[PDB]
Structure formats: C-alpha cells, structure tokens
Amino acid sequence: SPLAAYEVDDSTGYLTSDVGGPIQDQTSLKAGIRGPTLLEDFMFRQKIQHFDHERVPERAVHARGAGAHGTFTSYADWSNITAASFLNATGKQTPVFVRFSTVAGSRGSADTARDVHGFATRFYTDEGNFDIVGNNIPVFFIQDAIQFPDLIHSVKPRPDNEIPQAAFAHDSAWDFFSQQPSTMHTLFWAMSGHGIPRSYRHMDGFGVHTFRFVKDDGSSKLIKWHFKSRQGKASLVWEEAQVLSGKNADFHRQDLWDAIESGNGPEWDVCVQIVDESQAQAFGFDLLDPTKIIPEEYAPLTKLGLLKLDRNPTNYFAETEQVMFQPGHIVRGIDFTEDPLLQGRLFSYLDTQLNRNGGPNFEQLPINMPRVPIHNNNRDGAGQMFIHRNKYPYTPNTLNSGYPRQANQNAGRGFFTAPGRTASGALVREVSPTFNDHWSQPRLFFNSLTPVEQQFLVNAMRFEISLVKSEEVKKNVLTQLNRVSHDVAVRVAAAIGLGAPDADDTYYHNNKTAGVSIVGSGPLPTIKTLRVGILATTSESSALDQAAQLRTRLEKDGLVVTVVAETLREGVDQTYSTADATGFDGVVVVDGAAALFASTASSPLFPTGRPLQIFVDAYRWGKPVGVCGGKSSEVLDAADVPEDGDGVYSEESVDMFVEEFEKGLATFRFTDRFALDS
Amino acid sequence: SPLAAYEVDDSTGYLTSDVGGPIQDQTSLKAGIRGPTLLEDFMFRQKIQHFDHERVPERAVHARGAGAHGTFTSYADWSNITAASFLNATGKQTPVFVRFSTVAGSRGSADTARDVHGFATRFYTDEGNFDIVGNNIPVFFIQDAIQFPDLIHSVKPRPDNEIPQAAFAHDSAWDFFSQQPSTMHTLFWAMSGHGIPRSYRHMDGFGVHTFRFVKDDGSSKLIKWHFKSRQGKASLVWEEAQVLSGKNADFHRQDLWDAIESGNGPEWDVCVQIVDESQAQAFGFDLLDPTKIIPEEYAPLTKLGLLKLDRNPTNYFAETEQVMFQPGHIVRGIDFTEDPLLQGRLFSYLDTQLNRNGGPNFEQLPINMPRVPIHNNNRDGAGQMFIHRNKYPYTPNTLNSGYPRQANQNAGRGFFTAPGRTASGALVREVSPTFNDHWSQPRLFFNSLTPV
Amino acid sequence: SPLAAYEVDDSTGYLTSDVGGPIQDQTSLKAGIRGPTLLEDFMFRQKIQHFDHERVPERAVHARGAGAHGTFTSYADWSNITAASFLNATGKQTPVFVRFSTVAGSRGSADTARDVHGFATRFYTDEGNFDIVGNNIPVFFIQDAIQFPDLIHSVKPRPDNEIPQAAFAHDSAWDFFSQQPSTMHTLFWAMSGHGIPRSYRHMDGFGVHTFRFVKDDGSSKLIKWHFKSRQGKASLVWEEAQVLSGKNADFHRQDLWDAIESGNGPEWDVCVQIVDESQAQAFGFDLLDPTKIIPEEYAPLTKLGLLKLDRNPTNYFAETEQVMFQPGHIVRGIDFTEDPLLQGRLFSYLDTQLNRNGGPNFEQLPINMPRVPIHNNNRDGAGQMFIHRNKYPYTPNTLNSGYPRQANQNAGRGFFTAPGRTASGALVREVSPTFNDHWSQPRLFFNSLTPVEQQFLVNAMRFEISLVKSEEVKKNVLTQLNRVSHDVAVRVAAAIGLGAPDADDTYYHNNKTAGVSIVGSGPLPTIKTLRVGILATTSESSALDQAAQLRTRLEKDGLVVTVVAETLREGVDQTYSTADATGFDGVVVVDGAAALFASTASSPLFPTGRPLQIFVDAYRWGKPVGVCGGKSSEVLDAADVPEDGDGVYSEESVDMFVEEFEKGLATFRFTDRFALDS
Numbered sequence A, C: 001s002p003l004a005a006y007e008v009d010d011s012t013g014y015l016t017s018d019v020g021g022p023i024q025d026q027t028s029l030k031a032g033i034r035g036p037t038l039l040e041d042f043m044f045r046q047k048i049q050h051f052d053h054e055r056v057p058e059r060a061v062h063a064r065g066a067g068a069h070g071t072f073t074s075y076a077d078w079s080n081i082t083a084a085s086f087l088n089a090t091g092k093q094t095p096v097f098v099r100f101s102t103v104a105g106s107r108g109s110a111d112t113a114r115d116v117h118g119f120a121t122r123f124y125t126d127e128g129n130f131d132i133v134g135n136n137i138p139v140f141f142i143q144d145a146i147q148f149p150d151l152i153h154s155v156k157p158r159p160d161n162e163i164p165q166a167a168f169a170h171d172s173a174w175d176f177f178s179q180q181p182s183t184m185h186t187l188f189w190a191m192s193g194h195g196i197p198r199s200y201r202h203m204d205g206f207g208v209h210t211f212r213f214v215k216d217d218g219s220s221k222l223i224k225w226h227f228k229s230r231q232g233k234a235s236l237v238w239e240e241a242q243v244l245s246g247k248n249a250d251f252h253r254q255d256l257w258d259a260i261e262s263g264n265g266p267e268w269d270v271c272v273q274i275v276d277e278s279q280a281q282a283f284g285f286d287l288l289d290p291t292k293i294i295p296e297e298y299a300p301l302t303k304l305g306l307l308k309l310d311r312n313p314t315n316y317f318a319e320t321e322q323v324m325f326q327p328g329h330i331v332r333g334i335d336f337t338e339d340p341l342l343q344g345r346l347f348s349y350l351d352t353q354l355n356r357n358g359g360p361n362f363e364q365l366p367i368n369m370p371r372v373p374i375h376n377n378n379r380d381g382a383g384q385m386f387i388h389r390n391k392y393p394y395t396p397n398t399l400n401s402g403y404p405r406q407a408n409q410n411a412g413r414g415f416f417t418a419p420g421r422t423a424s425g426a427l428v429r430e431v432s433p434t435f436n437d438h439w440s441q442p443r444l445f446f447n448s449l450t451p452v453e454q455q456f457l458v459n460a461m462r463f464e465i466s467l468v469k470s471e472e473v474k475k476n477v478l479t480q481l482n483r484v485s486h487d488v489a490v491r492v493a494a495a496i497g498l499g500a501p502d503a504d505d506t507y508y509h510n511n512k513t514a515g516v517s518i519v520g521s522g523p524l525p526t527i528k529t530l531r532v533g534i535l536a537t538t539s540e541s542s543a544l545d546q547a548a549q550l551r552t553r554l555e556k557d558g559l560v561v562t563v564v565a566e567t568l569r570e571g572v573d574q575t576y577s578t579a580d581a582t583g584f585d586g587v588v589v590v591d592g593a594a595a596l597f598a599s600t601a602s603s604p605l606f607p608t609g610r611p612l613q614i615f616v617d618a619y620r621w622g623k624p625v626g627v628c629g630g631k632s633s634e635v636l637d638a639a640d641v642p643e644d645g646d647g648v649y650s651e652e653s654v655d656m657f658v659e660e661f662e663k664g665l666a667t668f669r670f671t672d673r674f675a676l677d678s
Numbered sequence B: 001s002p003l004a005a006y007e008v009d010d011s012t013g014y015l016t017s018d019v020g021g022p023i024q025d026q027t028s029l030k031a032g033i034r035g036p037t038l039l040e041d042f043m044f045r046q047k048i049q050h051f052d053h054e055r056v057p058e059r060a061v062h063a064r065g066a067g068a069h070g071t072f073t074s075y076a077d078w079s080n081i082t083a084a085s086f087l088n089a090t091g092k093q094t095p096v097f098v099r100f101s102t103v104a105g106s107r108g109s110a111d112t113a114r115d116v117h118g119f120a121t122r123f124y125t126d127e128g129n130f131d132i133v134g135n136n137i138p139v140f141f142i143q144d145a146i147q148f149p150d151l152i153h154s155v156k157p158r159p160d161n162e163i164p165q166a167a168f169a170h171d172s173a174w175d176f177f178s179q180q181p182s183t184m185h186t187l188f189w190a191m192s193g194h195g196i197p198r199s200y201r202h203m204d205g206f207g208v209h210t211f212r213f214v215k216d217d218g219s220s221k222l223i224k225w226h227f228k229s230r231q232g233k234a235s236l237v238w239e240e241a242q243v244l245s246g247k248n249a250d251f252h253r254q255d256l257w258d259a260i261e262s263g264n265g266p267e268w269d270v271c272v273q274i275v276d277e278s279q280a281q282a283f284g285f286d287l288l289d290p291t292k293i294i295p296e297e298y299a300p301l302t303k304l305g306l307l308k309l310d311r312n313p314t315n316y317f318a319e320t321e322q323v324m325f326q327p328g329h330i331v332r333g334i335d336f337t338e339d340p341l342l343q344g345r346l347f348s349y350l351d352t353q354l355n356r357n358g359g360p361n362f363e364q365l366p367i368n369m370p371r372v373p374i375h376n377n378n379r380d381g382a383g384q385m386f387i388h389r390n391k392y393p394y395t396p397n398t399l400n401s402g403y404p405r406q407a408n409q410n411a412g413r414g415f416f417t418a419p420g421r422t423a424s425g426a427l428v429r430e431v432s433p434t435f436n437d438h439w440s441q442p443r444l445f446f447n448s449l450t451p452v
Ligand code: HEM
Pocket: A058, A059, A060, A061, A062, A065, A099, A100, A101, A117, A118, A119, A120, A133, A134, A135, A140, A144, A145, A146, A148, A206, A207, A208, A209, A290, A323, A324, A325, A341, A342, A344, A345, A348, A349, A352, A353, A356, B048, B052
C-alpha cells in the first residue's frame, strides 16, 4: 500500500514548516506591538499560501460524493470466461476503493436530491488498476458521448443566474428531455424511487455499457456488470427527501461512514449478464445502445464475487476528493465495445484529470497508484514524484537492453484488443437506426412497477413538471410521455391543467421485467443499521426507564437507537429541538410521554407541536410507528393514527413490541398510506 | 451592460469551432455506422475538452454566493475628509458589482444555513477599482490573519469524512470557539437572527476593520464602513431556515435576482463612522481590534452616498464566479490600519486568485477590468491578452522617454500611505494587551436584543 | 542514494501504464491495417498526454544551470556565534544540493555567456532545510527588490522580437545601467573575468546580503557568507568564451558532471565575515546596502566548514530542474536583515514556485523534502501526497490534545526573530541617503585588478558598448563610467566613437582590496581535471607512440588527456574535425606530427588549416603550449610562436616536458600575450 507510506502522524511534536523548521503560527510578526505586519514573516506567508491554494476544481459531474475502502473476493476461477487476473481463483482478494455520488449538484449540494447516482469502483489488481465507473441506474440519458455537455448544461442550473440547484425542477432540463427522446428511459428511472435511494448501501451499481470478457485464447463474450446490494433496495419518499436535504445535507455520506464504523460495512454481489457476440441484436434492441437493458428473463445474472466496504478514509480530501477514476483503467481479460457513449468516455476521463490535478502526474497520488511496479517511459511533468533510473527512456533501445519490453497477447500479460473485433463501412457521423426505439423500454420499466410505485413516479413528474414555466415545453413533455404511456401523460397532464394528446400506441405494450421495482423487492434482508427514534420525556422516570428497556433490546439486534427528550441527560441522545422524523426509519413513543403529544404543545426548548410532528411525519412517510407501554389510545388519537393500521404498533409487553416493530422495519414502508389516482 | 464589449450573441448562426470553422456537435465520427469513434474527430475532442475543463476551484471561503451590477451615487463633495475621487462631487456616479455569500459551505450548499455572510462591493472608479470586502456582521472571530486557517479548518467539515456541512453543528467548531475566546462577539452575532437573514437585501454590510480616510493635504481620520439597508433588517426563524435549505437552496440568490428583474433593486446608504486618530484607544477598546464595534452612541453614522443594485448578470460563471475581490484594490484617499487581521488579508486575496484563475492575468477578465487605462510594466504570464507596444518596460528608462511616470502624493494622483503613520518598537510576534477583553462586547450585544 | 526511496528501476520488466497494466507503445490501434486511429486507444493517449505535458515554466531568472549532491562538514561547534544546529559540532555532516547557473539566458542558452552566475546551496539540516541562494559576484545591481523586474526586463531580450540573447549586447541594458548608477559595482564585476568563469568549480559563492547569526541566548552579529573555492579562481578569455558558446553550450555543466564522475568533486570552504551590530555604518557604507562589500582588510574570513559536491543526479528534471530554493528556508540561529533587496526576495521565491510547480505542494517533491518530520496543519491543495491522520488541524485545540505544539525561542527549538531588532520612524517609500555612493566601490574593485586584467575589463566594455545603437545611451554610459574612473571612460570612449567627459573626481581614490582579482590570485592549487590536448597523426606510427607515452605520463597526475588525429582508432579520442582549442587547458604537438602543421593543410576529413589553428588559438588565448619529442622548430615557426616564450615548451624528454608543462597548467594563463593600451 502506497497509502500507508504516506500517512502522517501529528499526535505528538512541535509545529514545523513544510521543510522541517520548528515554528509558531499564532501571531504575525509586526513592527512593534500595535504595528504593521512584516513581509519577512515567512511563517505567516507559508501557512496562508497553503490555505489560499487548498481548493481544487470539483468534478465536472458527480461533484457531491463519498468514498470508502474495502476488499473484493472472487467466488471462483473464472478463466473459462475471462483472462482477468483478479477473477482467476477462488477466494482471490483484491483491495478496492469506491466512491458514490449524485450527478448534477455542486459539492455541498444535498445528498438527497432527486438525481442519478454514481457508483465507481477501483480494483487495485495484481495486473493493474481496473475501474468500473458505474451508476445506480442501468441505462443512460443519451446515445453518443458528444452529447454529454448538452445533457449536463440542460440539467445544471440556468447559466445566467445559477438557479436552480434541483436538476429536474426547471425548464431547460425538460426542454432537453422532450427534444431528445433517448432520455425517456433514464428519466423514468430517475422519477422512480431509484432517484432518491434510502442510502448508498440500498442501491445497486451498474456498468451501463456492454463490455467484453476476453479469454486468453482470444475469444470474447458480451457482458453487463451488475452490483447487487446485499442490504436490499430501498428509497426515501419525496417529501422526506426534501426535508432531509435541509435537516441533513450529508445524510448518505453519514449513513455510509457510520455503517462502516459500526462493523456493518455494506456488501454487493458483483455479477454479470454474459451473452454471445452473435446476440448483439437478438433481444429486440442493439447491445451497443446504452439506453437499453437486457431483461433478466433473457440473460440471468452470474455471481462473480463479493464486494465489501469496511474501512473509511483517513483524509477525505487526499483519498475521496482526489480519487480519479477512468474507464481507460482496463486490464487484460476485459475489452470495450463500440457503444458511442462508452467510446467518448475513454477520452474525457484522462483529459479532465488534468483540470482537477493541475498537472499530468495524477496517477502518482497515493489513492491513484497501483499495487504493482510501474515500467514505462513517461517522464517529467509538473509534480513528478519519481526519480527514474533508466536514462534511455525510448523504444527501441540498446542502451537499456530493450527494456521495458513490449507487452501484448503473447508477451508480458499485455492488454490486447479482442482479436475478433472488426470495423467496416464509411467514416460517418450517423446514428445507427437500431438505436431508434426510445419508448418501448421506458414502458417496460413503468409496467414492472407496483401500483403505488407507479403513483409515486407519476407524482414526481407532476411535482417537477409543474415547476416548468414554459407551456410550450410542458406540451412537448406530454408529447413524449404519451409515446411511453397514455395513462402517464393523462395523469401528469391533470396536475398541470393541460390536455394530454391522444393515445399513440406504436410503442405500447404490457410486458414486464423482474428486478427493477423497489416496492416489489420484498422486505429487507437485514435491519442492522436501521434507525429507531424513541420519543420520551424527562418529566417521568417511567418514560426514561421504558426507553432504556427498548434500547437494550433494539441495540442487540443491530438497530441504531436515539432516545429523544426535551433536554439531554444520561440515556438521552437528542433533544426535540434537533430531532426530525427524517432521522429515523421507525418511531416509538413510550406511553409515559403521552402528555407531550396529546397537546398543541408548548416549551421554550422546542418548537410548538414538535414531538407530535415527528410521529405524524413518520406515519405519513410510511414508516413503522408505535406506542410501547400501556395506553396507546391518546397518542394514536392525537396523531390521527389508526390503531388497526398496518405498520402501527401498540403493545404493553416490550418483547412483543420489539418483535412486531422489527418485522415493520424489514417491511420498511407501509404503502397503503398513499392515495392513488382512480 | 457595463460589460457589453465582451458579449457574445448566439441567437442566430451555424455552430462553429472556437476558431470559426462551421461544424456539427451531435454525432461522433465512427468507422462504420456501428463502429468505434475516431481519434481524428476534432469536433468531438474540442467540445469534450472544453466540458472537461469547465470547472475552476471554488473560493476558499465564501464559496456560495450571488452577485449583481449597479450604481453608487455620492451625496456630497467629501474632499474635506478624503481625496477619494468617487466621493469628490455631489451626484457623482460610479458603477459597482456586489457579491453576497455565506462563509463556510461549498458551492451548492444552501443559502439559508446559519452562518456569517459576505457583502463584497467593487466600485469601478475613475481612479481605479476600489473594493470593500465586507460581511453582514461588523466584528470578526479572530484578531490576527495568521489564525484564519485555524478558524476555517475548525468550522468547515471534519476532514476525515467531510461531515458536517453546517458550520456550527460539530465539536471542532465549538472546541475552537471555547479555546479562542476572541470568537465570542461574532459567535453571538451568528447565533442571532443575523446568522439567518431574510434576504441579502434585508441585511447590512460592514467593512469590519478600521480604515483611514486621507485628504490631499496628508491628514487622516479613522473610519468604519456601514452599508445600511433601505429595505429594513429581517431574519428567518431557525425552523423555517432549515426547511428552506431543503425546499429552496437558492432562496437568497432567487430573492435578489427577482427583486432586480421586477424593478425593485435593493438599496443601501453607504455610511461611515469617522473618528480622530487620537481616539484609537478612547472608546475603552482598541480601534485596531476587529472584534469590537464603535457604539453609535459614541460616533454617529455619516451618510456618504447611495448603493443600488439594478442589473443581473448575463453569465453567472463569467461575472459572479470569476469576480476576484481584493482589499488591496485601494484608491488614493483611503489607507490601511495596523489591524493585524486586515494586514494579512492584503497578502491572501492577491495570492488566492492564482489558485482560482490558474495564472497571473486575472485582472484582465472582463469583470475584473478597470474602467480607466492601465499604464505599467507588468508583462507576459499565462493568458496574457494585452499586446504591449512599449518595448522598454523598465524604470528608469530613456528609450521610452521615462514613461510610464511615477505617481505619488505630489504627482499623477498617486496612492500614498498616510504620511502621519509611524512604527516603533521591537519586531515582535506578540498580541497587544489592549486586545484582551473578549467578553464585554458580546455582553453589550446580548443586552441590546429584545427578550424574545 | 539520498533520494533512494523515490527511485524507480526499469532495468527489467514489461512496459506498463502508470497504473500497472502491461501494455505496448509502438503501434497505434487502427480500424484496419491502413485505417484511422481509434479514440479507444488509451495506450496512445496516456503516453502522448504525458509527452504533451512534460514541460514546466523555466525559472524567471537563472533558467540555465546544473546541479549536484554533496556533503557539508562543520569544522567546529559554532554555538559561540550561532544556534544553528548544522554548525553545532566539529565534524557534524549535513547533506547538500547545489545548483549553479547563469542569470539572463533561457534554459537552453550557453553556459559561457558573459553574465552573473548563481550558486544556490541547500543544507538538509536536522532542524530543517536551510538555503543560501548566492551568486559568484558579492554585490548586486540594485538596492531594492521592487526594482528587480526593471533590471531583468532591461537585460533580457528586447520584447518586440526577443533579440538578443546576451545580456549586455544591447541598448536597453546599458540604458538601465546608465540611469540606475547603483548598477556600477556589479557591472564592473560582470565585465571582469568573473563574468566568464572557467568553470563552476573555479568560482566562489556569496550570500551578497548581510545576514544575522543569532545565538541561543538571543544576541546577534552581522555576517556575510563567502564560499571560497579550493580549486582556485580562473576565467576564460572572451574570444574563447564566444567560441565555446557555439562548440559546447554545455561546457560548465559537463565540466561539473565529469569532475564528479572522476572522483574530483569540487570543494569550498564555507566562510563568514562576522561583525558587530554596532558596525552597520562603521566601514564607510551601510551594511544593509547589497551593492557594497566589506573589504577583507576590515573584517577577515572565518572558516566554518567544508562543502564538497560528489554525487551527480539520477534524473536531471526531477532533481535539478525541480529544485526550488528560497531564502525563506531559514533555520534557528540565522536571521534576516533590513536590506531592502533581501526583504522582497523573501516574498518572491515562495510565490514563484506556484508558477513552476502549478500547485502549492512543491515542498513535497523529493528534492524539496526535508530530512526530518513535518508537523503542521497545512492541508489539501492540488497534488497533495500526504495522508494526514490528525483530523483536528487547528490551533488552539483540545481534540488533538494541543498538538502540534508551538515552537519559539524558549521551547521546541523554534525559529525566532533576533530579539534586539527594532524599527522606528515613519512608514516610508524612501531610499536611505546612506545608500547613495554608487561609484567608490566600483573604483576599489577596478583598482584591485592587475594591469592586464584592467585591460580585459576595458575590452569587455568596449566590445559590449560598441553594440549599443543609441548614441545618447552611449553618452550616458560614459558619464557613469567617468564617475568611477576617468581613465576607464577615456579608454572605452576611444573604441566607440565618442569623447569621454571631463574628469569628475568626487569618488576617485587609489585604495585596493585583496581577494577580488583573478589574474592576481596566483597559480591554481591543483591541476587535477585540467584538459590536455595532444595533437598527433595517423600518418606516422611514431606520432601515436609519442602520444601514448605522453598520455600515461599526464594521466598519472590526474589530467584529462585527449589525443587528436585525423580519424579515430584505439588510443585516439577525437578527430581534428570535432576538436577545438576551447576543448583544452593546454595543447601539446608530438613532433612526429609536424608535417600537419601548415595553414596549407588540406583534407576531406577536416577544415583546411585545422591542426595548426588549434595550436595557434591555444597560444593566443594564453594557454600553455608546446612540442614534445626534440624537434620544435617546424611547428613553432608555422604557428608564429616564439620558442623562448613563457608558457611555450620544447623537450625531447617526456618526463621533463611534462614537469615543465604542468607548471604552465598551474600558472594557467600567460598574460604577456595580450596587448595593453598605452
Ligand atoms: C454510462 C454512462 C456514464 C456513467 C455510468 C458515468 C459515471 C460517472 C461517475 C460514477 C462519475 C464519478 C466518479 C467519481 O466518483 O469520482 C463520473 C464522472 C465524470 N464523467 Fe461520467 N459517466 C457516464 C458518462 C459520461 C460521458 C458520456 C462523459 C463525457 C463524454 C462523462 C464525463 C465525466 C467526467 C468529465 C467526469 C468527472 C471525472 C473526474 O473529474 O474524475 N461521463 N461519471
């Protein structure tokens, strides 16, 4: 590890300059005690120059994100399908670093914005660094990389005033979507719960593009990468996500960090779909088109190995901010395809690192270094950290005995382009007509959602599109939505007071696919790390005792428990003033606290009606909620919460309450609380 | 627009490269209709290279902010207290640009966080650009610029995990405040409604530091700048600010934008407290200490002129993101004081623009340019736009007839340091004992608030 | 070995990317064998991106230079005059790196231009890096750092056409000198032999400024740094320097490299003049004025230790090009003075490294690292290598238990400003009248040169000034020269078509000072590394035999021998076609080769007259020359060289030839061959 060698320990010692001279740094050098500061104060200038130059350009996209270290372990020797060394043996472990992100917001923007999300994984393999630079949605908005600035300019804030930070809440974004129909598949995903995942740990990762697996014999197959969450899939509800974006802008980065610090590091099965070269157009669409998925019914997933994140960074800036991913970081055994979105990406990520790093030696940053020797004739450049011994860095040479040697298919384990690949035809700036069906798969995705999930998507569209000022853009939007689903266009049109255009059934169908729905993916497989808010009072010794009782039990089941009361003390984590339902996955009121709720209700220590509002919000947003200890009635009545409601608990027995409530936490959302269009 | 000369119109025309060759930009050049992309596709590369390099480093502090253009109008001829040209005639008008901001959060952090706020004003005067780089709170946390990184590291997110955004909600910030008691006065202000103003239009601007006004005869007085809102002061309530941060992270920038578009451009009376040099220690504290206000009961405000913001930018990046303020942008008639916070600032803002701009010619960006001619011997550097005719850029010269000439108090309307300033004593890294009362003024402030 | 941890070996292995993936780099990936190159060719792009970004800005001055590693060893414990740790014990060793340079030319300009030269030394001390950033001339052109760009613009090429390279050969430089008379002292130095040293090893190093030595008790003394060459002082003659600029632009860098490779690493005694603070104005000038020396007659040198350079770099770019010196790299025991030239330097060198390195972490380059631990709260910035474990990098803190601790005079061996220093008075942009005598010291320096040396300086002035177009500028130059010396003005004026102004005796005097003359500094103390060219012929096996004999005699004494003949073979190093007298410190003809020695001598293998012209040029340029074997007349008469001349040798006996000739090498130059004005 190059990271270990560069760890700097400041737990002891006297302050020094960056050249080891002991110094101070608290008072400027001045000509007399009330005098002007001196130019000769080097202590001052070196410290302030450093401060003045701390910042580097944020990423052009995916600026907001967070990372962690961990380990990938192969489940088998996969030699039969790829020459990739990291996959060549059962149990082979390779270090990883992952960064997760949103796409459109700047650094500092909230984690819980509605957006596409990044899931970028570096495997520090024994034959070079291999990056899979993925998203949590398996399809992308556009079909050619040259369009990327168009898409991004359209979704980022309007450039006269840099308003708004909400990617989908403005005219220009919808102008682009409605004029560029390829966008429809990703737009439907982004309008689903996949736009507001519950956490990084509760989403999947996709390579998006078709890639190749290449064997040592030169043969190739076509693959899609799928990183399948072992935590289960889960989303926020929209109103919850909007509150969260104010109450805790760092919600996802904090959820990740805390899960790793508690020993609950997240896991994914790294999987592929594998198909033959001859099936490039067999599935009703072109595998070069990054706006299409291969339905799992046509190509099942094969599990290749386990990805686990189990260590946090030491210095966020040095590790997370400076990690520089590239789809060009490929290894023997993997190759590209002619997907025009992937093709252009290869150029963009090598170039943009010059912008961020300010010089060409970015791969020498510890987080970017490989874990094998580097042998090449790259030299000089700003920020050169190596002292190269070889004074004849050219090929061919005799003066260094012909080293470094060329690597290729038959030497040195070289990378090699899949040798079956060809190209033929004119040199064209033309779109393949095989790419032209922009609507069937959006409809496939929509069909595969549950009824209340369909409602949530329609409601997201109603919310966002109602913020578009231009009537002409809104009509254009309905034109495209209607090519996917007339019912979607009708329902969305109703909220914005326009008429939907008449049904156009060209692309309509009733087909469905497995594995895309959040609401239909079933209870979570684990409730470890999920958050329980226990609403108590310092008024009643019995209330605090009840909360402590609940705590001990819930904690041994891996839940993160917060006891809330008017003021802090022994056993109480959070005041009502700072508490919010967005902080919890379930809320329990201890019945000793009934007085705070069954009330209007007033104190200089928190806002009027806060305790009840926490419970009310939690219910409205679908969470398991309950009252533990004796007389539920009054709290549930004060909240207008029905005691017979699914995911509403009322028990005197602490043990029965915990059992029932824990089943609620796995269910995670009670969707019968949300109204549906008739 | 005052930057009309630099505008580029794209309401008509065919797409071109940056060198005027008509091109397309929607499909990559490929070897066959389902083929790989070609390296010879210059259309693709020049567009993507530009996109790849769009971003520049955010400001080290005050990263989150918004700006507008306007006009300053002097109420009087202020010659009898300052030689400043922009203040030398009743009704004299000078263009301005102002940027408002928070302090701690990054780009895209919400407007309605609890924080200190910036209020930075550029006057494009007929004798040079003059910047007053102020905040909405009249006192600062610390008493020496060398401590700035300490303060800022402590309020910014913890550096292992970059949590939390939200300057005051974590241990390190309160560790620093409690170890560095100078911070109490600004801390009390930030914990008041001044930490969550209703808009940029409903807050005041303060230079914080004592500065000097200098007359053409060389006499000086000590001043504090106060920009007093004509919209009134108003705050959010905290609960509301928290919900707004989520519902509308752009709330202050939109409020300002909208007010200008509707013809309600915000206004401030630009004022000063003026006191004699003999009064530097007369008010029971030291006027060099930036943690203290001069109570208005001791020195009333004089209104100098009107600041009105009435024109939004054309391109946010080019104007607002790229504007580069400096307290060293000073003009004849103003001078510095030995406030050790101010003193170090003068170094920081000139250096940090190298970081943002990536080269030394940042004064050439349209928003940074002055509105009068430039005559000097600065040359070259990355990004040099100017084509200088003078092929002898050194002084003293005879081969360019001794031009440019030196400007000073007696010739050429030069800047000059206030000639009554002196220094005396040991060269010390010592804090004046006159700085040591960290608590009385925070109590003055608290006492001055209503009960609620 | 001092930077061994950063070394990269490429003597074995297969080529890899920068992230360790084995690759090739000799053929682009193409769509067919005669097809266009593919964007997906990451091998191509990463290699070419690196190439495209290899260059960094050259230094703003001193762009042309060369460097080496070495060791400093202290002669004593100097705690009686300084707290500095590297000087605190007899025998104490500290690693060093030195870079030597010219000043005006760009990084590809010739070594042997007439110029001021740099001598910058880094001591990697056990209390931090300490740099002495000196020159080979003890005084500077200007008295205030603010004037630096005026000076440098005036000497660098005219900015319309970037002509001429060659600092003194144009109007603007002499315009500046004549308008800014402070320049006279350094000008007279640069017009002497000190402007064209024979090698970096044959020049001294000076700090120029008065600095302070500060004891641990707080008391201070004023010092000047003098690095006195143990190789002796030596110059080129001007015509020779001009020829060398064309025949070997790398002459000084090669001389240094070679001396080190041969185990003849150059040495200096590091010395100071030490005077009391009360003697700031006692010597008839102000010690804050960098245009003045303290004559050695008023303040003798104290030898502090030995500097020896003995290891060449491994990678020039990484070590020599990237070394970033600063006078701000100061250590406890040393302080600044209020010299206004020094004061502003402190700002310049910290700022300019942002330009060169392109980011703030330049102290992390291996050559710039200290050799002790770094403990501070500087963070982030582009190119940040360090992974800092202290997540509370602010002072004051409790969450990192108050570390790093402040260092100062009384704790932690902090740097401290000399506590006796004060300032008093108005804040002014005024020059001290104590700086106003710009002419007395130039006259002192001129008076201390020998007659022939004064002639050489006049002749350099005549050469350069005659290239100034402007008759006004020429007139103004003679006004200033005449204030130093009427006779200089007269003699210069005679070459350039003008009358000198009448004598103005205000600053005239006859005082002299020791240690500044080159011609007067006596024979060299060592002749090891000096170059002897033996001119032979392949047309007589006897001539080669003589050459071989002489070679062994000369090599025994550490001279570097080149045997020249018409064509190469074993024992012959160089052809006449490539050889030139600039290549040698002495020239010997073996008498077996006498037939070659005619201006008549014609051949397709070398220019007509070449063998003889080497001998004639050597003679004209002052060098020891002779004929070995017993028959000298034919060669000597062809050369018009008299047999009884001083530094002309003729002997049959090889031993007796060599004994005589080695005395001539030590004398080095026979100045009786140069005409004097009468
Ligand atoms: C399938 C389509 C894509 C996926 C899945 C994807 C994914 C991502 C991810 C996850 C990141 C963030 C990596 C990190 O965490 O540091 C990112 C950054 C970026 N992407 Fe993409 N991307 C796609 C398409 C594009 C295209 C078409 C372009 C350009 C033509 C592009 C240009 C960029 C740039 C310039 C960055 C910033 C990289 C950096 O500064 O390190 N991407 N992408």
